[PDB]
Amino acid sequence: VTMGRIMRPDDANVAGNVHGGTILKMIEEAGAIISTRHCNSQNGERCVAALARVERTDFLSPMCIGEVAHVSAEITYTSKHSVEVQVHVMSENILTGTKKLTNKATLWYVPLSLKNVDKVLEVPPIVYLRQEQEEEGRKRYEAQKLERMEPEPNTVSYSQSSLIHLVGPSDCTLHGFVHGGVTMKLMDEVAGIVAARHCKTNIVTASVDAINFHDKIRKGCVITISGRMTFTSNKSMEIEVLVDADPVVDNSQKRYRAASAFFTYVSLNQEGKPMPVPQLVPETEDEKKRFEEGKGRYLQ
Amino acid sequence: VTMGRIMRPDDANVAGNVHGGTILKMIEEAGAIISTRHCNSQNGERCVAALARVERTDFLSPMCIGEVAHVSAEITYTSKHSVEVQVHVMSENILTGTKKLTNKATLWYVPLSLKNVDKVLEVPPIVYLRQEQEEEGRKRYEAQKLERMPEPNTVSYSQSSLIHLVGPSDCTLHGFVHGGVTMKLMDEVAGIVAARHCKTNIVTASVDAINFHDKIRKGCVITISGRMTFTSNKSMEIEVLVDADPVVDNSQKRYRAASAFFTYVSLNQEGKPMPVPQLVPETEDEKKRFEEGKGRYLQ
Amino acid sequence: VTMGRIMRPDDANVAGNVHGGTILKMIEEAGAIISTRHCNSQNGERCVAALARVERTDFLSPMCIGEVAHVSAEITYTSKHSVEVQVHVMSENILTGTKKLTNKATLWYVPLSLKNVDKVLEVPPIVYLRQEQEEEGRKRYEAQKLERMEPEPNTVSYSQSSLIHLVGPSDCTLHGFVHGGVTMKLMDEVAGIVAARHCKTNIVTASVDAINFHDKIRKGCVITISGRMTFTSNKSMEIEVLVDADPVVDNSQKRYRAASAFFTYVSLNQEGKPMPVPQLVPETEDEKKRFEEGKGRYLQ
Numbered sequence: 005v006t007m008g009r010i011m012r013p014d015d016a017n018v019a020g021n022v023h024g025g026t027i028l029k030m031i032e033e034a035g036a037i038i039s040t041r042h043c044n045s046q047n048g049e050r051c052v053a054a055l056a057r058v059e060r061t062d063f064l065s066p067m068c069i070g071e072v073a074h075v076s077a078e079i080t081y082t083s084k085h086s087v088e089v090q091v092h093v094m095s096e097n098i099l100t101g102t103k104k105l106t107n108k109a110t111l112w113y114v115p116l117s118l119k120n121v122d123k124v125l126e127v128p129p130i131v132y133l134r135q136e137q138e139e140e141g142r143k144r145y146e147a148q149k150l151e152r153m154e155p156e157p158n159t160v161s162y163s164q165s166s167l168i169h170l171v172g173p174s175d176c177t178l179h180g181f182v183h184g185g186v187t188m189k190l191m192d193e194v195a196g197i198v199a200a201r202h203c204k205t206n207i208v209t210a211s212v213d214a215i216n217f218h219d220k221i222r223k224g225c226v227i228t229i230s231g232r233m234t235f236t237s238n239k240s241m242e243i244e245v246l247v248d249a250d251p252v253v254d255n256s257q258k259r260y261r262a263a264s265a266f267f268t269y270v271s272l273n274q275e276g277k278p279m280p281v282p283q284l285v286p287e288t289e290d291e292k293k294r295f296e297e298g299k300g301r302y303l304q
Numbered sequence: 305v306t307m308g309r310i311m312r313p314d315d316a317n318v319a320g321n322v323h324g325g326t327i328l329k330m331i332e333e334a335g336a337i338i339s340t341r342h343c344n345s346q347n348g349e350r351c352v353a354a355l356a357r358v359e360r361t362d363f364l365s366p367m368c369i370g371e372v373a374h375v376s377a378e379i380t381y382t383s384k385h386s387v388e389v390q391v392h393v394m395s396e397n398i399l400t401g402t403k404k405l406t407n408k409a410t411l412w413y414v415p416l417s418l419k420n421v422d423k424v425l426e427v428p429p430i431v432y433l434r435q436e437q438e439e440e441g442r443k444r445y446e447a448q449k450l451e452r453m454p455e456p457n458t459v460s461y462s463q464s465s466l467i468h469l470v471g472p473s474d475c476t477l478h479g480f481v482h483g484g485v486t487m488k489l490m491d492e493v494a495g496i497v498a499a500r501h502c503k504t505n506i507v508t509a510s511v512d513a514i515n516f517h518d519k520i521r522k523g524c525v526i527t528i529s530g531r532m533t534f535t536s537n538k539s540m541e542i543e544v545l546v547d548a549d550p551v552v553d554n555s556q557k558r559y560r561a562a563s564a565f566f567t568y569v570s571l572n573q574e575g576k577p578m579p580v581p582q583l584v585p586e587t588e589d590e591k592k593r594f595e596e597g598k599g600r601y602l603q
Numbered sequence: 604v605t606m607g608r609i610m611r612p613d614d615a616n617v618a619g620n621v622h623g624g625t626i627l628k629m630i631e632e633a634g635a636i637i638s639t640r641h642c643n644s645q646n647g648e649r650c651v652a653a654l655a656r657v658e659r660t661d662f663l664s665p666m667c668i669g670e671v672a673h674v675s676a677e678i679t680y681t682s683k684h685s686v687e688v689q690v691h692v693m694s695e696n697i698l699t700g701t702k703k704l705t706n707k708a709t710l711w712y713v714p715l716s717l718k719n720v721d722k723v724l725e726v727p728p729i730v731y732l733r734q735e736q737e738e739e740g741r742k743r744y745e746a747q748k749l750e751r752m753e754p755e756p757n758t759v760s761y762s763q764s765s766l767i768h769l770v771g772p773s774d775c776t777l778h779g780f781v782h783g784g785v786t787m788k789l790m791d792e793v794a795g796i797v798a799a800r801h802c803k804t805n806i807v808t809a810s811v812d813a814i815n816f817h818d819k820i821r822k823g824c825v826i827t828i829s830g831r832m833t834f835t836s837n838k839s840m841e842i843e844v845l846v847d848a849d850p851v852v853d854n855s856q857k858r859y860r861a862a863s864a865f866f867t868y869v870s871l872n873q874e875g876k877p878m879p880v881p882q883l884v885p886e887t888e889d890e891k892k893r894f895e896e897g898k899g900r901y902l903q
């Protein structure tokens with residue numbers, strides 16, 4: 005699968021840097037296609053790939069308005085029930101001929117029966133070229149599968165932000181449920197705002213930390229994305245984003261945590277270089293704890 | 305000053321009733337065009353009409369997915385610096401031929417120089433047919449100009465806020481936000497507040513007059529917070545407040561961009577307004593607002 | 604240069620048939636990229652390809668919500684100042700594996716200097732494999748270049764429709780001007796409505812006639828697209844769409860005709876595929892003239 009979009013002004017901030025989420029949403033659409041295709045290639049029961057996991061990912065070069073984003077997405081492994089997908093995102097400038105690699109990314113998709121909602125299915129095998137690929141896939145397939153068992157300025161409340169979104173039909177999969185990209189894009193929107201509130205300047209997504217997608221969200225759910233700062237290095241900003249879901253339609257289905265992530269953001273020079281960041285000053289018990297966990301995550 | 309949109313599923317809730325804000329945004333785009341055209345018809349300095357006021361407005365019939373919304377927008381009056389615009393919004397069903405009037409609406413626009421930001425200009429005269437039109441315009445032009453001088457079923461249970469970074473397609477050809485973009489975001493919030501409370505399908509029944517105090521620039525992050533005030537047996541008042549932070553400037557401080565009361569209705573699976581769970585104020589300010597809300601609801 | 608993307612409910616009518624315009628816009632974005640790239644490949648003065656012409660084009664199979672549209676776009680010829688581009692559009696259903704060809708299409712782009720607005724430039728030569736390609740290109744490059752030196756139900760007023768659009772920044776190429784796709788999409792939106800009003804049923808774009816793009820439209824222009832029926836065969840509907848532009852700003856300039864086209868539309872069964880169409884009954888002089896010109900065009 006492959007990639008064409010020319011980045012419009014709506015894909016980017018006022019200073020013309022494309023939003024991290026904008027790229028995240030494209031990556032996912034690519035992944036979602038290649039994987040739903042292949043999960044129906046052996047012609048079992050009809051399914052749809054749903055985004056389950058995304059690996060850490062760093063934004064190498066900025067992308068700008070007018071550049072074409074190229075998105076190539078290959079399947080790298082399968083397990084019994086999961087599909088690994090790696091994705092490369094490259095920015096072509098078509099005036100100067102220049103190219104840069106913006107982004108590598110790895111994703112984990114899982115087929116859900118279209119007939120039986122919530123029924124996981126089996127992922128057909130893929131044909132490799134060497135064993136080392138399958139092993140490297142299995143080691144990475146283990147490494148993820150293990151980790152899954154495990155108001156004052158410059159203060160966290162000053163920049164704290166939340167956003168609320170009613171899930172519409174084009175947010176959703178052909179079935180009632182939301183895309184991974186729709187979610188990831190809304191998360192960046194929030195973290196982005198948190199970051200900007202704090203820095204009081206231009207900002208861009210430098211990196212995103214592994215995400216896991218716990219549960220589905222249905223059409224008509226109103227989802228709330230709340231985001232708050234955790235850590236600051238001299239030149240960066242960690243931001244915890246939490247995503248909750250209320251089904252308003254049902255009295256007997258109670259709110260739940262759909263997903264959560266840490267987003268790192270960068271300030272930028274009017275000239276186009278990362279600048280030093282105003283330092284976050286925790287105050288409560290939990291604030292320093294999270295600031296410390298945030299130094300910890302930031303190292304690894 | 306005429307139309308055709310056909311209402312897609314993204315224009316409407318899961319039950320297929322078009323969003324109030326979806327209509328509000330179409331009404332405004334119409335008003336914004338006709339008025340910016342006419343404010344450049346005598347060929348003075350180059351300007352852009354900016355939405356200053358919207359009159360009370362009630363949603364008469366529902367509009368549904370697949371129906372064509374027709375939006376006709378006529379200029380009804382001018383003052384020295386303002387433009388009255390009336391807008392009719394009519395829903396055609398194109399399977400059954402049926403038509404309904406969804407909405408009349410009146411809007412007040414004001415030309416701002418494109419060269420000189422913040423410089424109000426003069427609105428050319430329009431040609432009427434009778435004097436009674438101009439008088440009725442002047443009386444209405446005065447009438448506005450005078451008026452301008454967590455427990456379930458509790459307000460905190462349904463309280464909701466939304467935060468939006470103003471992008472380029474939100475804005476006018478200049479740094480500033482459309483009236484329709486704002487009105488649509490307000491309905492998004494009030495809509496959610498309403499739904500949280502009712503726990504059912506809901507639609508915008510009416511919107512009170514709104515006044516647009518100040519501009520909002522590209523790059524401003526705006527926060528729209530909405531909370532219930534009053535409940536009649538079958539309706540829901542919802543106060544929506546819209547604040548603006550320019551994040552870029554340290555020394556330009558937050559401000560209140562606009563505020564409004566939105567009234568919302570629950571609907572029977574069968575398609576009829578039904579009784580609403582009653583809001584129970586608790587604080588001083590909650591009963592005050594509940595009472596002001598009975599007061600507004602009468603008039 | 605090619606890609607595809609998954610068709611959301613926003614890409615399609617209530618009955619889930621993708622809009623003709625939706626496809627037209629994708630075709631153009633593809634064409635616009637490949638051609639602006641190549642017009643800067645020999646590294647002259649910096650330019651942007653602008654859509655000048657689109658050939659007749661017919662919609663072979665319908666496309667539905669959930670299907671992936673694949674758009675491949677190759678350069679087929681160049682002249683001194685113009686670029687031919689052919690585009691294939693194929694619909695993959697990713698539940699059933701099925702594929703169909705939806706659409707072939709040919710487009711003519713022309714580089715305009717980014718520094719000097721309105722300054723046409725020269726198109727680098729392309730490397731062919733056989734001469735017959737270049738000749739077939741030249742014959743088609745001539746064939747176009749020649750042709751360019753030339754309220755009662757079921758009545759035209761009943762279905763007549765117009766739409767008015769303020770040109771925003773994301774409608775535009777980086778420079779002040781509108782995309783060909785933006786225009787083509789708005790034209791279909793209107794013709795689509797005209798068709799639906801008349802049939803009183805589901806409808807889809809069956810075909811579109813060659814379009815020529817006379818003049819540019821700038822950011823901030825308000826454009827009016829008016830559409831009205833001309834002819835009806837037993838099973839089809841011709842619809843004339845006219846596109847006017849007012850520069851409301853710097854209004855020493857008067858409104859101008861940006862472009863015009865005839866769009867043919869088809870009614871469809873719930874089962875799907877074409878039904879007989881209520882017959883249009885002209886009434887004025889000009890209505891029968893256009894009804895007759897419409898029989899004439901419909902033959903050839």
Ligand SMILES: CC(C)(COP(=O)(O)OP(=O)(O)OC[C@H]1O[C@@H](n2cnc3c(N)ncnc32)[C@H](O)[C@@H]1OP(=O)(O)O)[C@@H](O)C(=O)NCCC(=O)NCCS
Binds near residue numbers: 058
């Ligand atoms: C993915 C999902 C269906 C798993 O369902 P479940 O009832 O927990 O079933 P399990 O956890 O046993 O999942 C079975 C497979 O899921 C995989 N899986 C579950 N969570 C995962 C994660 N976070 N990352 C990668 N794989 C995951 C397991 O690796 C397992 O595969 P294997 O058997 O081949 O090793 C569930 O997490 C879900 O509903 N996710 C939401 C999907 C979605 O809506 N995406 C967008 C949301 S914003």
Ligand SMILES: CC(C)(COP(=O)(O)OP(=O)(O)OC[C@H]1O[C@@H](n2cnc3c(N)ncnc32)[C@H](O)[C@@H]1OP(=O)(O)O)[C@@H](O)C(=O)NCCC(=O)NCCS
Binds near residue numbers: 384
């Ligand atoms: C409309 C606006 C320009 C008025 O500016 P101001 O500094 O109040 O200027 P003035 O008081 O001299 O008003 C001049 C005219 O504006 C009209 N006006 C101002 N506020 C108004 C309101 N709320 N409703 C109707 N008319 C209004 C006056 O009636 C007056 O016209 P007149 O002289 O013919 O009676 C200003 O309030 C503004 O910029 N508003 C925001 C516009 C905008 O950005 N809208 C979109 C945001 S969502």
Ligand SMILES: CC(C)(COP(=O)(O)OP(=O)(O)OC[C@H]1O[C@@H](n2cnc3c(N)ncnc32)[C@H](O)[C@@H]1OP(=O)(O)O)[C@@H](O)C(=O)NCCC(=O)NCCS
Binds near residue numbers: 656723782783815818
């Ligand atoms: C295309 C355009 C630049 C032509 O300007 P012009 O003043 O006619 O310039 P010229 O006639 O010298 O054009 C030279 C080349 O243009 C090409 N051209 C112009 N109009 C064309 C048409 N309608 N179809 C095909 N080719 C066309 C010719 O093929 C010619 O190439 P050649 O010299 O190699 O044979 C002008 O019509 C324009 O700017 N149109 C709008 C472009 C645009 O904005 N498209 C989207 C609109 S919604």
